[PDB]
Structures are given as C-alpha cells and as structure tokens.
C-alpha cells in the first residue's frame, strides 16, 4: 500500500499541474512526460482485488483517477493520441471496479459533472474498446443510483449517447456493456424511456437484439435488449408508428417464444412487454390471439416470480376481454 | 442489468 500511495501521489501531482495550466488562462502538460500511463495501469490492475480496492478507497483513489480522466479529456478532447486513449481506458477500468457495489463511489463520481460529461463524450471515441470501458462505468453508476445521480446521468445526455453508440458498435463485448447500462438507465424515469425511443433506428435495433446469436453461448444481449424493450414498452404502446416498427421486425412472435426461456429474466421481460402491447390495440390483440398467446400466457399465471405472474395475468386479461370477432364460433 | 467488475 506504500506503492499504491506513491502511484496516487503521482496522479494528484500531475492533475495539480494540469489544473495550474488551466487556471493560467507554463507549457501544456503532457501525460507522457510524467509517466501517467504505467501509474494508472498498475492501479487498474490492483483494483480487481477487493482488499486493494479498500486500501485505494482510504486514499481517495476513485476521486483522483476520475479527476485525471476528466482533466485529460478536457485538455485533449477526442483529438488525442494513443497514450491518452490508453490512459482513459485504464482509468475507466479502475473506475468500473471501484464503483462496483460502492454507494459512496457512485455518488462521488456522479456528483463530478465535468467528469460525467467527459465520460459521455468518450462514447464517440475511435477506440471502440474505450467505448465498452465507459459503458461499463455508466452501467455501475446507473445501478441503484440515488436521486441526484439519476438526475445527473440524465442531464449529461448519457441515454441518447449510449443508444446512438449501440447502433455503431461492431463487437459483442461493447454491445453488452452498452445495453446493460441502457437497461439500468431505462428504469430510472420516463424521459429516459422517451429518449431511447426517439433515437432513429433504436426500436428496430432493440427488436433485433431479441434474437441475437451469441457466439459465447450467453443470453446477455437478449436479456438486456429485452429489458430495455420491456422498460420502454409503456411508451411504445401509446405510439402507433413505434408499434409498427416492432410488428415488422417480428417482435410479437419472438416475445411469445421468449415465454419458454429457461431464463426468468427473458420470460419476465417478455411478460412485461406483452402486458403493455396487449393493451387497447385490436390488431396486436388479434395477432397475439392468432399465435396462441392465450394458452401460452395461461401457463405462467402460477409462477413463483411475481413479475411473470402479474404480467402474464395482465396480458391474458387484455386478450380475454378482447376476443376478436372472427373467433366468436365465427363472425 | 445489475453491476459488475470490469470484464
């Protein structure tokens, strides 16, 4: 922990020098000249171990690493070299580890507005790996966020930023971290739901995540995508254009198939989504009747899982109360 | 989604 103490001192000294240069507005500090990259690299590596994290937190390590990330982004923006990219990656990983399950760390980082804007800005980085790193931070920050944190996460545009990011990512690891953060953020409030739905191509994209073929034998993408979809389905139900996007990307059939998943998360997400979409739309009700939704949902009403039991029963009630004309023996 | 250490 003498070592950790020395690394954090180097970082704080460098930041002070940066803040001094900013306040003057004596050449512009460059991270390479103070060997910042090895310093953060080492702290990042230590941060995977829980006992080292506790040592790091005694030294205000989260605050110092965040301050470094912020001042580099401010100084060099996204018109920056690989040393700076590397630095932000290793810083971001440390912040991910340090915010995991830590009430105080999450609240501190979300109160750092400048640092928050800087994180969001990195979702446009040329390093897609850096994007994944930032989305991992935002994922943790958005889990069990207090009132002030939720407000800041919204006000710095994290949701639109993450949704836009998702549309351009080429790699599954990036998509996983980006969707996981969106899933958490989509639960915070109604404006977040609206902002997700307002991004052009987002609904079609989320529908596509419902049948993602993970080459790592995992359900993470389908879970987070279906989770986002379930959280925004309340608003989608009010908008006929948005319902139509879902229809023409085969959302309804896929959701029925989700009802049979071994993942309770997938079944719960599907029940929640079907609950909302089965409300007040004759044509979606009719489509769901035609695909045998009624018996499918009836099979879940006695679930142990409270959201599957209430969602399945609510969707079933919407269908049972609106038996289509053609079903009435006929006519 | 929950939260996680960096992966």
UniProtKB/Swiss-Prot annotation, chain A:
ARM repeats lie at residues 43-85, 95-137, 138-181, 182-228, 229-273, 274-315. Changing residue 106 to E: Impairs interaction with KHDRBS1. Phosphorylated; phosphorylation enhances the F-actin bundling activity. Phosphorylated by GSK3B. It comes from the Eukaryota. It is found in: Cell junction, Adherens junction; Cytoplasm, Cytoskeleton; Cell projection, Lamellipodium; Cell projection, Ruffle membrane. Signal peptide: none annotated. Expressed in a variety of tissues: brain, small intestine, colon, thymus, skeletal muscle, heart, prostate, lung, spleen, ovary, testis kidney, placenta, blood and liver. Isoform 1A: Very strongly expressed in brain but has relatively low expression levels in other tissues. Isoform 1B: Predominant form in all tissues except for brain, including gastric mucosa and blood. Changing residue 139 to E: Impairs interaction with KHDRBS1. Tumor suppressor. Promotes rapid degradation of CTNNB1 and participates in Wnt signaling as a negative regulator. APC activity is correlated with its phosphorylation state. Activates the GEF activity of SPATA13 and ARHGEF4. Plays a role in hepatocyte growth factor (HGF)-induced cell migration. Required for MMP9 up-regulation via the JNK signaling pathway in colorectal tumor cells. Associates with both microtubules and actin filaments, components of the cytoskeleton. Plays a role in mediating the organization of F-actin into ordered bundles. The microtubule tip localization signal (MtLS) motif; mediates interaction with MAPRE1 and targeting to the growing microtubule plus ends. Forms homooligomers. Found in a complex consisting of ARHGEF4, APC and CTNNB1. Found in a complex composed of MACF1, APC, AXIN1, CTNNB1 and GSK3B. The complex composed, at least, of APC, CTNNB1 and GSK3B interacts with JPT1; the interaction requires the inactive form of GSK3B (phosphorylated at 'Ser-9'). Interacts with APC2. Interacts with DLG1 (via PDZ domains) and DLG3 (via PDZ domains). Interacts with alpha- and beta-catenins. Interacts with AXIN1 (via RGS domain). Interacts with ARHGEF4 (via N-terminus). It is linked to Familial adenomatous polyposis 1: An autosomal dominant cancer predisposition syndrome characterized by adenomatous polyps of the colon and rectum, but also of upper gastrointestinal tract (ampullary, duodenal and gastric adenomas). This is a viciously premalignant disease with one or more polyps progressing through dysplasia to malignancy in untreated gene carriers with a median age at diagnosis of 40 years. APC mutations have led to some interesting observations. (1) the great majority of the mutations found to date would result in truncation of the APC product. (2) almost all the mutations have occurred within the first half of the coding sequence, and somatic mutations in colorectal tumors are further clustered in a particular region, called MCR (mutation cluster region). (3) most identified point mutations in the APC gene are transitions from cytosine to other nucleotides. (4) the location of germline mutations tends to correlate with the number of colorectal polyps in FAP1 patients. Belongs to the adenomatous polyposis coli (APC) family. This is Adenomatous polyposis coli protein. It comes from Homo sapiens. The lineage of its organism: Eukaryota, Metazoa, Chordata, Craniata, Vertebrata. The chain holds residues 407 to 741 of 2843 of the full protein.
